[PDB]
Amino acid sequence: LGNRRIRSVGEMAENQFRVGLVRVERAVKERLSLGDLDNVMPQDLINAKP
DNA sequence: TCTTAAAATCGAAGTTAATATAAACTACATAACAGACATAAGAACAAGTTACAGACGTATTACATAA
């Protein structure tokens, strides 16, 4: 049992949230690379639905 | 003749009922929807054509009455 671990609701919630965050981060990096960022707000860059 | 990667299999019922991310403008042709008209089909009324029924009228026979 020192070689097997317990993973609870907090850990897997964190894991899935991090997966969604990476999913957002890919598109955010794609958008930031364009350059035209004069009229962009932080709420116009991320994607809450993933 | 000996490794080494693939290929295939692994009990019945029973229950069970799904998800959820990520160009715009313009030009043209076609299909669909609505309205109106004509047509075909049925409903209604009235008449005509025809035979039979229902009770009457007639014809026939038998009884009664008159000579």
Swiss-Prot record:
Disulfide-linked positions: none
Superkingdom: Bacteria
Annotated family: Belongs to the RNA polymerase beta chain family.
Role noted for this protein: DNA-dependent RNA polymerase catalyzes the transcription of DNA into RNA using the four ribonucleoside triphosphates as substrates.
Subunit structure: The RNAP catalytic core consists of 2 alpha, 1 beta, 1 beta' and 1 omega subunit. When a sigma factor is associated with the core the holoenzyme is formed, which can initiate transcription.
Protein's name in the database: DNA-directed RNA polymerase subunit beta
Organism annotation: Vibrio cholerae serotype O1 (strain ATCC 39541 / Classical Ogawa 395 / O395)
Name of the encoding gene: rpoB
Whole-protein coverage range: 448 to 497 of 1341
